[PDB]
Amino acid sequence: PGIAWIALLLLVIFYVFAVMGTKLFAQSFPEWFGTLGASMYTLFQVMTLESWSMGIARPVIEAYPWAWIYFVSFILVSSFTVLNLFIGIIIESMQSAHWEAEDAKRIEQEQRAHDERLEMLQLIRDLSSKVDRLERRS
Amino acid sequence: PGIAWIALLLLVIFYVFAVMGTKLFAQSFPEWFGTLGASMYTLFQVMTLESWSMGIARPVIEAYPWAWIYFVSFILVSSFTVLNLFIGIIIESMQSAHWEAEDAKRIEQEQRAHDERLEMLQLIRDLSSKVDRLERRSG
Amino acid sequence: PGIAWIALLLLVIFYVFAVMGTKLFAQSFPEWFGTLGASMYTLFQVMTLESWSMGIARPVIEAYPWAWIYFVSFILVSSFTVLNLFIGIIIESMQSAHWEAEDAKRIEQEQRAHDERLEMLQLIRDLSSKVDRLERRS
Amino acid sequence: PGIAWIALLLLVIFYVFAVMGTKLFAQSFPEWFGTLGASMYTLFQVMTLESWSMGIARPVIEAYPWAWIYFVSFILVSSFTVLNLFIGIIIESMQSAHWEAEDAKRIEQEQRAHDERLEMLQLIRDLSSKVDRLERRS
Ligand SMILES: [Br-]
Numbered sequence: 001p002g003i004a005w006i007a008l009l010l011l012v013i014f015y016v017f018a019v020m021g022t023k024l025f026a027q028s029f030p031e032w033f034g035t036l037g038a039s040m041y042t043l044f045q046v047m048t049l050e051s052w053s054m055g056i057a058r059p060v061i062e063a064y065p066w067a068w069i070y071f072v073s074f075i076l077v078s079s080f081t082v083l084n085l086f087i088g089i090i091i092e093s094m095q096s097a098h099w100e101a102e103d104a105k106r107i108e109q110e111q112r113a114h115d116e117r118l119e120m121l122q123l124i125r126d127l128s129s130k131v132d133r134l135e136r137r138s
Numbered sequence: 139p140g141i142a143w144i145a146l147l148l149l150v151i152f153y154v155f156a157v158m159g160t161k162l163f164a165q166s167f168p169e170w171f172g173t174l175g176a177s178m179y180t181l182f183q184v185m186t187l188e189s190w191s192m193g194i195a196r197p198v199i200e201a202y203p204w205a206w207i208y209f210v211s212f213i214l215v216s217s218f219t220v221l222n223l224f225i226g227i228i229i230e231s232m233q234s235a236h237w238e239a240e241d242a243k244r245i246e247q248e249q250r251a252h253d254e255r256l257e258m259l260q261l262i263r264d265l266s267s268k269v270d271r272l273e274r275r276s277g
Numbered sequence: 278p279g280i281a282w283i284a285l286l287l288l289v290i291f292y293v294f295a296v297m298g299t300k301l302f303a304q305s306f307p308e309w310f311g312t313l314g315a316s317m318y319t320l321f322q323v324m325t326l327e328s329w330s331m332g333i334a335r336p337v338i339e340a341y342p343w344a345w346i347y348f349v350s351f352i353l354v355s356s357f358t359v360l361n362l363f364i365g366i367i368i369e370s371m372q373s374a375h376w377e378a379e380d381a382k383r384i385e386q387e388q389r390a391h392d393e394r395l396e397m398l399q400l401i402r403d404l405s406s407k408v409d410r411l412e413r414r415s
Numbered sequence: 416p417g418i419a420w421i422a423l424l425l426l427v428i429f430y431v432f433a434v435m436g437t438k439l440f441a442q443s444f445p446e447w448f449g450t451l452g453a454s455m456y457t458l459f460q461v462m463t464l465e466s467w468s469m470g471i472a473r474p475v476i477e478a479y480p481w482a483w484i485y486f487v488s489f490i491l492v493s494s495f496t497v498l499n500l501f502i503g504i505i506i507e508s509m510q511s512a513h514w515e516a517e518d519a520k521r522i523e524q525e526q527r528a529h530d531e532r533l534e535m536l537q538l539i540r541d542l543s544s545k546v547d548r549l550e551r552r553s
């Protein structure tokens with residue numbers, strides 16, 4: 001029903017990496033990826049882009065050469081998601097603030113003007129046969 | 139009076155978490171939370187996402203193993219709430235640029251054409267009256 | 278010329294403060310604030326929020342327990358500003374692809390509507406004034 | 416063709432600084448700029464502002480005291496390039512959310528309108544005939 005529809009995806013991506021991660025790293029890096037609960041703190045810390053490479057990534061990377069793939073793919077993807085959620089909430093915001101509020105009038109101040117043109121139509125009809133019942137009564 | 143109302147909710151959160159923070163951690167971390175004034179600067183650093191977990195929160199969590207809920211809830215709450223400030227501003231920014239200005243130039247653009255039709259609407263009724271009299275005066 | 282009126286202001290504050298902190302701090306921390314051009318860098322990394330407190334301000338604050346006003350002012354101030362190039366480029370951007378081309382496409386559909394409405398106006402007059410003429414001879 | 420047009424820019428801005436970095440620091444900073452990949456990563460770490468100054472630039476600046484150029488420039492180049500891809504993505508967002516329909520739904524309203532306002536050019540000319548034959552039938 002709107003944005004929380006990626007907000008689910010984000011939660012899903014997240015939990016996918018916490019498992020992907022505890023499942024490689026818990027072995028040599030308990031403090032970070034030991035428990036599942038472990039893998040999430042560490043991952044939301046990565047999410048905050050606070051000491052992601054220097055603090056967490058680089059120490060794991062020298063242990064597991066390929067471990068960038070994980071950290072980076074994760075940040076790329078996980079941010080590309082939040083980029084949306086954000087934009088989504090921008091749109092979702094101004095769609096309220098303005099657009100809906102204004103469209104309601106562009107329609108209804110154009111209902112008002114549609115009827116205005118109708119009432120002249122009728123008036124010009126009625127007249128128009130009076131004018132040719134001066135041509136039948138003359 | 140608008141978004142300025144919400145930056146009161148964000149000054150209350152800092153306070154809720156600072157008293158909460160001094161009253162909790164001061165004893166073992168006089169560094170950060172040992173007074174109020176410091177437990178805010180620590181909260182302002184934790185808000186800027188500067189070292190919040192390596193420098194502050196992962197040390198704290200060593201001594202009280204539950205304090206993550208303190209920091210994860212603070213980053214969330216104190217972030218979501220300055221998403222509102224970066225939004226409501228972003229909007230009442232657009233609002234001045236455009237909406238107020240053009241929105242009013244359509245109120246009037248219709249106003250002016252409304253009167254145009256309400257003037258046409260006139261003559262027409264004027265003409266009817268004239269044909270009507272012409273009608274009666276030869277029956 | 279608009280946008281860079283804030284960019285010129287930001288350039289200012291960067292300098293206002295840069296002198297500020299070379300004057301106050303350059304003796305106790307020559308590494309960070311030694312020269313002026315040394316604060317120009319250091320305030321650039323404070324601005325991007327990289328180890329600003331824990332590695333710079335907290336260390337200076339130990340020297341001058343009131344320097345936090347120097348740091349917490351700059352953060353707030355240079356933030357609020359940095360925001361408005363973003364909000365400034367946003368606005369001027371939307372402006373390009375949409376806003377400008379809309380007021381034109383609309384003013385001009387209203388000219389036509391106006392003139393169509395004008396023709397009708399004169400047309401009724403002449404018809405009002407044939408019947409004016411006809412009624413006086415009747 | 417849009418934003419992946421800017422996506423290549425950011426990719427070719429990286430590529431450049433990457434080779435430039437390795438051909439600059441690879442002698443003294445093996446772990447950071449020891450190879451091309453090495454630098455690509457390190458720059459993503461700098462690009463995400465994660466620990467860039469106390470960790471990379473400052474300790475590098477130590478050996479080449481001009482290096483700030485490289486780091487402070489790459490920051491500004493790449494972060495602006497992301498502000499574009501961002502914006503062109505906020506706008507192409509708005510477009511399909513709102514501006515799409517609201518511009519089509521108004522052309523179709525000024526169709527309705529013009530037609531109505533023409534419908535009565537008709538009546539008003541017809542009536543101007545009947546009344547033109549009341550003036551000659553006299
Ligand atoms: Br709009």
Ligand SMILES: [Br-]
Nearest residue numbers: 117255394532
């Ligand atoms: Br009309």
